[PDB]
Amino acid sequence: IRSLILTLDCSEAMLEKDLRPNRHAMIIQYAIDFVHEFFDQNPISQMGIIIMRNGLAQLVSQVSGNPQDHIDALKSIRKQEPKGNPSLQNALEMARGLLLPVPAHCTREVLIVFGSLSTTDPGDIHQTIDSLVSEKIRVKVLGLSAQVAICKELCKATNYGDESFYKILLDETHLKELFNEAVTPXXXXXXXXXXXXXXXXXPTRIFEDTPTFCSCHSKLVYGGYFCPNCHSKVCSLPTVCPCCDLMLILXXXXXXXXXXXXXXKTFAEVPTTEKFRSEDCFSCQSRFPXXXXXXXXXXXXXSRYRCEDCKQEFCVDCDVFIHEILHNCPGCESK
Amino acid sequence: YPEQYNYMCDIKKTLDVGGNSILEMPSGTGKTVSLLSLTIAYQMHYPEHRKIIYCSRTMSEIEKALVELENLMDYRTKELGYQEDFRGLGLTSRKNLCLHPEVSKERKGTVVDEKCRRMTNGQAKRKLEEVELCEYHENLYNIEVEDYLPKGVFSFEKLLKYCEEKTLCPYFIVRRMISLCNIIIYSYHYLLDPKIAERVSNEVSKDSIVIFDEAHNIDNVCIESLSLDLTTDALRRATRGANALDERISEVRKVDSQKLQDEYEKLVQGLXXXXXXXXXXXXXXXXXXXXXXXXXXXXXXXXXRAEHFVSFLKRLIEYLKTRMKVLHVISETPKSFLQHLKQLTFIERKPLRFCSERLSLLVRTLEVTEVEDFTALKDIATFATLISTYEEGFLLIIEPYEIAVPNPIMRFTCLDASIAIKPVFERFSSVIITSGTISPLDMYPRMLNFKTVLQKSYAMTLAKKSFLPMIITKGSDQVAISSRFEIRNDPSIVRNYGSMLVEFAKITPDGMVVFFPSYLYMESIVSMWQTMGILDEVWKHKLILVETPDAQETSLALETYRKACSNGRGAILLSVARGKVSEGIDFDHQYGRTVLMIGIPFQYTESRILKARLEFMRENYRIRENDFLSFDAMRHAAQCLGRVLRGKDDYGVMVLADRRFSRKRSQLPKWIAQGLSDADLNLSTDMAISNTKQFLRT
Ligand code: SF4
Ligand SMILES: [Zn+2]
Ligand SMILES: [Zn+2]
Ligand SMILES: [Zn+2]
């Protein structure tokens, strides 16, 4: 579904002490949490880490659905020192060579964490921006403080003529907010194209560990997933089986689709003097008054979050709890 | 916009009441404000009434006024669907608006008019007694060619492509279209021209609306209209020019003497009035503004011929070599110099009429006239016209003994600048006087006395997008007063000043333009800067404007500066605030987002031209040692202020050094004083708040 290509700046501009302790020690650290934010909500998606060091582009993490491959790839970058200059043309041309195995049915995304202010590209960088629109590659650049005129054209021409993707970060708290929105998908208006995907087999949970069985490694294992097509007991994963090119997901894709179909109905916060109901919660027991600023002009006023799907009173605490996980408002399941 | 309607309601109230209005406009936000109101005031009155007359200061503002008029016609043909009587004429230069010197001559200089008169008289020689015409003559004055402009807009670039496809001439189309009177776009060097404006004023035939565009260097054009230097090499041209007239009088009196004898009787009867009336489509002579000189009933060397007129001229040039052969510093009164001339040779009081008739005579007499010889005669004849009349405000100065080799340099000082601006008030009414680089505008009621109204810029909003700070302490507040002196005192401080520029450019490496009050400060640090980290890790390439800035060098430094910011590089534009190319094009991120100024702009003092104009304006307006160091220093700084304000959509930071800027005013006076190292953390915030407040105010 998704095949994100992480583009990290690893140059001498990241040696500055803007963040704590520096820019490179927080970019690598927050990206490990972004790997955890990506494979949980999207367990059947892809990731790819491309650094920009010494005026080139180095591939440290291959495109794979295993999250541990991107963790250990980022543990080796923090050991060395970011040197050189960023190369946006070599990073995008390397991102083009990996998204060509990615089909048109899977969405191709490129995220650029650009903390520098000057890059070193070989040829014309405008020939690389127009190539990402020809094969439809959604590029998003996260610039630090000042804005670059190159990233304005990159986050607009590759994004259906709309410049709203080149975001400017100003704090480490705001940098984690960018990793929460990038973990979520981008359900845009698209270009109205056809879509049809098949060949999705089911993994049989096998636990044979006497003399073991491994079709993707030929080693000892404590139980692997059996493919429903080639009948191979490879590694237990919700991705594709490496013997007949068939999937092996289960309820992991159903949980991602349930979150994708989650519209999250926010409860309408009506006052206790306006909704004509007592202070109560449909999820728990919020028997305390919300508003209590003034004497009796606010304490008797209060607020009761009335969800319009079942006319159930709630508070402000469980209205964000029902929209985060599970189903939006538990009164919707009862008629 | 509502702020653009505030100046438009003032333009709709002054064009139908006042005769001249000093309207102040903000920078980068007043171009199309008066453009649409000029076509709306004509549409509210009559569309064939008073046409629009535009007076730019550069050729770029002539080119920028043509594309905005296309947007006015596109807004009138899409929102209305009716194609009315079109107008608009691109009156540009002669070397640019040509076809013949771009094919065979391959020269883009000032000699394009010499091949023009050779083809005009060559077509006249092919249609009288007999080279011939050119590529496309005897067809551009047709009625179908006169209708190619009210039907289709073909001005400058659209007309140069039209004269190649239809095979026409760009000179005879535009010259025949001043009489049609359209929306005429031209610069300040044509309205106050003593060889062009005498021909322009006879074809517009008045009754129009003059639009003064960027009217802040009006006092500079009136000085540039005169003041010619005589650096002794013209005496070698006048010596060889006098011997050429001796051979020409020997050639005229050897065979065909009836052509000069009948011209002598035509000058003894029809004089200069019939001589100018008979002469058509030929090379015109020179005069000191015939619409301002006003002289009639002349005589040809007191009923004499060309043989007696060249004897007075050879008597004249040796006296000029006698007066130039002097000591050093010596001033001259133009009336007392004429009295010392009459003690040498009685040349009466009218040599103004003794030269303009003989200049037109030698064109009709000598057919193979030399270029350097006849131009040497026009340099004397222009000086002979200025010593005959116009002595009030005039002054003759001599350059001193400056090694002395380069010492014989003679110059005449211009008169009052109000005299050149005088005939534009009685010829045209409702003259819209607009400028975006003026703060304040009270010197224009003072200097150049004319009765007008004063309107300021009523547009100031969104101060969070227009960062206007200023630097005071440069770490020690020593290099601010160090750049104040004219001479480069203490170059170690300038090396410390140039060390701060590498620190200042490395903070924000996203488009940098650095102005200078003189090229001496640019040449002082370029010899041994010992600091190229910004020229190898920040701005990389260097765009430094030299003192002898070539037109191709200024063009190549401008395009590569646009190529630097369009590749994620950034460049340093080291220009001169007193130099050429005042710019004005921005409204994008390709321009320098942070503009640096080295101190305050200064003027070249201790010069005879400045000391003459100091005592001249001391008797006029009593503004001695005030406006000369402040009103002139503001307008050279206001050209740097017109580039940062590129509309309300684009941001920009303009820092100013020293402390003498607080005594003057500025466009949108919202300025906070801080140090140099303090503004490095302020501009890092201003380059991040403006990136977050852009989507918040929408
Ligand atoms: S007619 Fe026009 S193109 Fe031909 S020489 Fe004269 S100015 Fe040039
Ligand atoms: Zn399989
Ligand atoms: Zn509750
Ligand atoms: Zn509900």
Swiss-Prot record, chain A:
GO terms for molecular function: ubiquitin protein ligase activity; zinc ion binding. GO terms for biological process: nucleotide-excision repair; regulation of transcription by RNA polymerase II; transcription by RNA polymerase II; transcription initiation at RNA polymerase II promoter. Residues 3-182 form the VWFA domain. One of its GO terms (cellular component) is transcription factor TFIIH core complex. It comes from the Eukaryota. A zinc finger (C4-type) spans 227-244. Keywords: DNA damage, DNA repair, Metal-binding, Nucleus, Transcription, Transcription regulation, Zinc, Zinc-finger. It is found in: Nucleus. The keyword Lipid biosynthesis does not apply. Belongs to the GTF2H2 family. Component of the general transcription and DNA repair factor IIH (TFIIH) core complex, which is involved in general and transcription-coupled nucleotide excision repair (NER) of damaged DNA and, when complexed to TFIIK, in RNA transcription by RNA polymerase II. In NER, TFIIH acts by opening DNA around the lesion to allow the excision of the damaged oligonucleotide and its replacement by a new DNA fragment. In transcription, TFIIH has an essential role in transcription initiation. Present with 2340 molecules/cell in log phase SD medium. Component of the 7-subunit TFIIH core complex composed of XPB/SSL2, XPD/RAD3, SSL1, TFB1, TFB2, TFB4 and TFB5, which is active in NER. The core complex associates with the 3-subunit CTD-kinase module TFIIK composed of CCL1, KIN28 and TFB3 to form the 10-subunit holoenzyme (holo-TFIIH) active in transcription. An additionnal subunit, TFB6, plays a role in the dissociation of the SSL2 helicase from TFIIH after transcription initiation. This is General transcription and DNA repair factor IIH subunit SSL1. It comes from Saccharomyces cerevisiae (strain ATCC 204508 / S288c).
Swiss-Prot record, chain B:
Disruption phenotype: Essential, it cannot be deleted. It comes from the Eukaryota. Changing residue 31 to R/A: Loss of ATPase and DNA helicase activities but not ssDNA-binding or ATP-binding, impaired removal of pyrimidine dimers. Loss of RNA:DNA helicase. Extremely UV-sensitive. Changing residue 98 to S: Extremely UV-sensitive. [4Fe-4S] cluster binds at residues 98, 116, 134, 169. Its main location: nucleus. InterPro entries: ATP-dep_Helicase_C, DinG/Rad3-like, DNA/RNA_helicase_DEAH_CS, HBB, Helic_SF1/SF2_ATP-bd_DinG/Rad3, Helicase-like_DEXD_c2, P-loop_NTPase, RAD3-like_helicase_DEAD. Present with 14400 molecules/cell in log phase SD medium. ATP-dependent 5'-3' DNA helicase. Component of the general transcription and DNA repair factor IIH (TFIIH) core complex, which is involved in general and transcription-coupled nucleotide excision repair (NER) of damaged DNA and, when complexed to TFIIK, in RNA transcription by RNA polymerase II. In NER, TFIIH acts by opening DNA around the lesion to allow the excision of the damaged oligonucleotide and its replacement by a new DNA fragment. The ATP-dependent helicase activity of XPD/RAD3 is required for DNA opening. In transcription, TFIIH has an essential role in transcription initiation. Component of the 7-subunit TFIIH core complex composed of XPB/SSL2, XPD/RAD3, SSL1, TFB1, TFB2, TFB4 and TFB5, which is active in NER. The core complex associates with the 3-subunit CTD-kinase module TFIIK composed of CCL1, KIN28 and TFB3 to form the 10-subunit holoenzyme (holo-TFIIH) active in transcription. An additionnal subunit, TFB6, plays a role in the dissociation of the SSL2 helicase from TFIIH after transcription initiation. This is General transcription and DNA repair factor IIH helicase subunit XPD/RAD3. The gene is RAD3.
